[PDB]
């Protein structure tokens with residue numbers, strides 16, 4: 001009865017009663033059950049599956065500028081059969097591509113989507129070993145990175161069966177610095193990854209107690225316990241934070257992984273659901289800039305970039321934070337362009353995302369947009385995606401959230 | 415079937431089909447019917463009214479740190495009677511206060527609410543003439559302004575009857591510069607008020623064709639045609655825009671009314687609904703700063719504050735707009751503090767709004783917050799009201815939107 005709500009930054013939580021007295025949405029919540037897809041303990045009710053699959057295959061053969069009628073029907077029967085006999089079914093890799101592409105084309109909270117059109121699909125379906133996974137990942141990371149010239153790709157591990165033979169990597173994202181909470185009340189690297197770093201420690205991985213130490217991809221292949229693997233340094237291409245003016249910057253000791261790749265997130269297509277399918281794209285300055293660097297609950301410089309900025313660090317009204325940040329954002333962006341790593345300032349992004357929509361509507365007359373997310377964390381009213389009214393909605397295929405593996409995991413370790 | 419959506423800034427509109435294919439919110443829309451209260455042609459179905467009123471009166475006698483049981487019951491019967499006999503009813507002014515206070519306390523999109531506790535109620539109920547209204551307004555404006563030291567207040571005009579004896583002022587807000595769209599494809603003052611300025615012209619008011627000319631409060635008292643009245647200059651206290659450094663600023667020729675007072679907006683309490691009740695509060699820098707000044711669809715300096723800022727006005731990625739704005743915001747704020755007019759930089763606001771909630775939950779365990787609105791148009795992720803999860807909802811009493819009078823108005827002019 002009491003809709004729980006939490007203030008991220010502070011980690012505070014309160015239960016809302018009063019909403020009951022409503023005259024008769026929870027749009028500002030982060031992980032609504034309305035956007036996930038948890039575990040299972042048995043396959044997928046044919047009645048449910050079968051009609052979905054028909055839908056998909058139908059969507060698929062829809063694309064073509066020229067129709068493959070026969071193949072369409074044919075494929076249709078082909079599947080039903082396949083399904084009726086076994087229940088489950090496999091998509092022709094070609095399908096899986098169009099899947100991932102659309103599932104992205106149908107991401108509600110991603111300004112990126114303007115080039116959903118071209119992504120790299122890594123058919124790791126045949127995968128079968130934890131260590132087999134790992135390798136498959138590095139192939140990705142390495143392909144993705146491309147020595148700074150980032151290329152976005154996704155590697156589809158094997159789908160779901162009984163839901164007890166799940167394939168899952170327990171990581172927020174491919175590369176992400178640890179976050180040891182040091183003795184002296186301090187806290188290193190990244191507090192965000194605070195609970196998880198503990199995990200990797202609890203499963204081996206030795207605490208280099210740094211503050212810019214990359215975390216171990218912890219994977220599980222069929223439903224058995226997960227295993228720790230250290231990402232091969234050679235693969236993690238970073239960028240150092242230096243200002244095109246404030247020389248005192250480098251002294252900050254700031255750098256950041258040049259590759260944003262989400263690990264934990266379920267892909268769902270034709271009634272089929274894949275519990276592991278890391279995908280990457282390149283950064284937008286502000287996440288690095290204002291989010292991990294500035295956000296109070298993350299790295300959190302600002303105050304310092306403020307003091308050494310000379311600014312009125314103690315007269316809030318001064319707009320010093322407004323000053324500081326803007327410089328920090330120019331640094332990050334700067335560094336990147338310099339050390340030759342791909343990136344994109346928000347403005348240019350928003351300008352393009354809009355172009356996407358005009359295309360998307362004139363195209364299929366829709367575009368699942370989540371304003372609360374598609375708006376640059378700073379400079380909102382200046383980026384066009386603010387004066388844009390948008391309604392969002394889950395479609396298909398679609399990338400979903402998932403429950404923290406460690407929460408719902410039958411530890412086969414007996 | 416086609417949810418229409420418009421991009422403000424550009425004035426573009428598109429109909430969303432695709433949402434139908436939804437797996438099964440419109441939170442980013444501006445004026446949902448879910449937040450209004452249009453016309454009527456007959457009173458209010460006793461069955462509807464009577465139970466509401468009971469609710470209210472009950473809420474009322476609830477407040478007290480010490481209960482007025484007898485008076486409570488008494489008042490209750492008193493009303494029912496009053497209602498059963500006539501249907502309608504009047505709230506003891508004292509009630510109307512607690513009304514307005516709560517109706518505010520229950521504003522979903524206002525960071526202000528942290529001091530809902532003290533507002534000024536102007537009982538203009540007895541009003542009866544257009545000209546009678548006018549005077550009543552100036553009393554407000556004048557009280558509100560207070561020679562810069564702004565004080566927030568509201569003046570409750572007479573309630574609703576048959577819904578054909580509506581009391582309404584056709585104004586976005588008390589003071590607001592005109593917006594003539596000059597011959598030479600130009601556009602002066604404020605394009606926002608473009609359709610309305612035409613109106614006042616169509617009803618008399620002479621076009622001083624300026625670009626900082628205050629508009630005429632156009633009012634209607636009982637349901638008859640509306641009449642034009644020029645706000646007495648002496649009452650409109652403005653502020654000139656000057657930078658605490660960029661001397662070349664004053665050359666911009668920028669100033670802005672120091673008093674934000676919303677005209678058109680219905681107050682609803684105990685089943686009773688008042689179609690006219692202007693209320694004011696003091697500015698938050700960013701609306702003036704980034705919204706009316708910078709917003710592409712408004713005044714729109716930025717580019718110039720950019721060029722004369724020296725900045726890379728042509729290399730979007732430069733973050734020049736990010737630079738420009740921040741200065742503009744310091745100016746506005748600056749001027750104000752200088753010319754001694756009340757104002758408040760967003761940061762300090764957000765810091766307080768949060769304090770409100772912690773209070774509001776610990777108080778009545780709720781707080782109708784609309785994240786999409788309660789977030790400063792610039793510097794979002796830096797203000798705490800971003801990492802705050804919030805669900806919003808219409809309660810009571812409550813200030814509602816209303817249909818543009820000129821749309822639904824039986825022009826008694828025969």
Ligand code: HEM
Nearest residue numbers: 104107109110111112115119152154279281282283284399
């Ligand atoms: C054109 C390159 C891309 C850019 C610049 C980009 C940018 C972004 C940004 C800025 C966010 C929100 C950041 C956050 O708050 O975590 C986001 C979210 C997201 N993007 Fe992208 N993206 C790109 C490509 C892609 C691709 C190719 C996919 C799918 C294979 C994708 C899927 C997603 C998803 C699912 C989210 C939501 C993540 C979450 O809920 O945590 N993006 N993207």
Ligand code: HEM
Nearest residue numbers: 518521523524525526529533566568693695696697698813
């Ligand atoms: C502490 C002084 C106040 C401050 C600083 C303040 C500030 C604000 C701000 C920044 C907004 C959003 C601006 C926009 O986008 O138009 C807003 C909206 C609003 N405020 Fe306040 N406010 C104050 C007092 C009040 C009071 C006393 C009332 C009720 C008598 C009130 C009622 C509203 C309403 C109804 C809205 C929504 C307006 C709309 O939907 O256009 N505010 N306020």
Ligand SMILES: CN(C)CCCOc1cc(=O)sc2ccccc12
Nearest residue numbers: 173260261262280281282283284287
């Ligand atoms: C997922 N999030 C909770 C954490 C990583 C930040 O995510 C991203 C930040 C960017 O700037 S670009 C991008 C592209 C594709 C996937 C993710 C991102």
Ligand SMILES: CN(C)CCCOc1cc(=O)sc2ccccc12
Nearest residue numbers: 587674675676694695696697698701
């Ligand atoms: C209503 N809006 C469409 C137009 C006026 C802007 O509204 C306000 C801007 C501020 O900074 S403060 C404030 C206080 C009380 C009412 C309104 C405001």
Ligand SMILES: C[C@H](O)[C@H](O)C1=Nc2c(nc(N)[nH]c2=O)NC1
Nearest residue numbers: 008028372373374800801802803
């Ligand atoms: C609590 C609040 O909903 C949350 O902090 C939000 N996070 C994000 C957001 N938008 C983006 N793009 N990324 C976020 O992390 N909007 C709101």
Ligand SMILES: C[C@H](O)[C@H](O)C1=Nc2c(nc(N)[nH]c2=O)NC1
Nearest residue numbers: 386387388389422442786787788
């Ligand atoms: C289109 C978009 O919903 C609209 O421009 C928004 N306006 C506003 C907003 N928030 C505030 N405070 N004021 C606005 O005018 N959020 C979103």
